[PDB]
PDB file of C-alpha atoms in Angstrom:
ATOM      1  CA  UNK A   1     119.268  90.030 113.956  1.00  9.23           C
ATOM      2  CA  UNK A   2     119.224  86.211 114.473  1.00  7.96           C
ATOM      3  CA  UNK A   3     116.147  86.461 116.840  1.00  8.09           C
ATOM      4  CA  UNK A   4     114.267  88.491 114.168  1.00 13.83           C
ATOM      5  CA  UNK A   5     115.277  85.936 111.508  1.00 17.27           C
ATOM      6  CA  UNK A   6     113.996  83.092 113.661  1.00 13.49           C
ATOM      7  CA  UNK A   7     110.663  84.698 114.631  1.00 13.23           C
ATOM      8  CA  UNK A   8     110.043  85.691 110.967  1.00 12.97           C
ATOM      9  CA  UNK A   9     110.570  82.018 110.036  1.00 12.15           C
ATOM     10  CA  UNK A  10     108.271  80.960 112.895  1.00 14.91           C
ATOM     11  CA  UNK A  11     105.480  83.287 111.650  1.00 15.91           C
ATOM     12  CA  UNK A  12     105.651  82.131 107.999  1.00 19.30           C
ATOM     13  CA  UNK A  13     103.911  79.027 106.637  1.00 22.71           C
TER      14      UNK A  13
ATOM     15  CA  UNK B   1      99.103  90.614 109.802  1.00 20.79           C
ATOM     16  CA  UNK B   2      99.529  90.439 105.968  1.00 23.88           C
ATOM     17  CA  UNK B   3     102.066  93.316 106.371  1.00 21.44           C
ATOM     18  CA  UNK B   4     104.102  91.140 108.870  1.00 22.46           C
ATOM     19  CA  UNK B   5     104.138  88.209 106.382  1.00 26.26           C
ATOM     20  CA  UNK B   6     105.321  90.430 103.532  1.00 23.98           C
ATOM     21  CA  UNK B   7     108.019  92.127 105.645  1.00 21.12           C
ATOM     22  CA  UNK B   8     109.346  88.697 106.828  1.00 21.31           C
ATOM     23  CA  UNK B   9     109.394  87.247 103.281  1.00 20.75           C
ATOM     24  CA  UNK B  10     111.345  90.209 101.983  1.00 20.85           C
ATOM     25  CA  UNK B  11     113.688  90.286 105.021  1.00 18.95           C
ATOM     26  CA  UNK B  12     114.991  86.710 104.733  1.00 19.28           C
ATOM     27  CA  UNK B  13     117.963  86.093 102.424  1.00 18.42           C
TER      28      UNK B  13
END
């Protein structure tokens, strides 16, 4: 799940 | 992509 965590963080602002 | 934002906010912990 760590890739999903990181891309969710990347998408947020 | 408002649904993506909301899913990512709720997913993080």
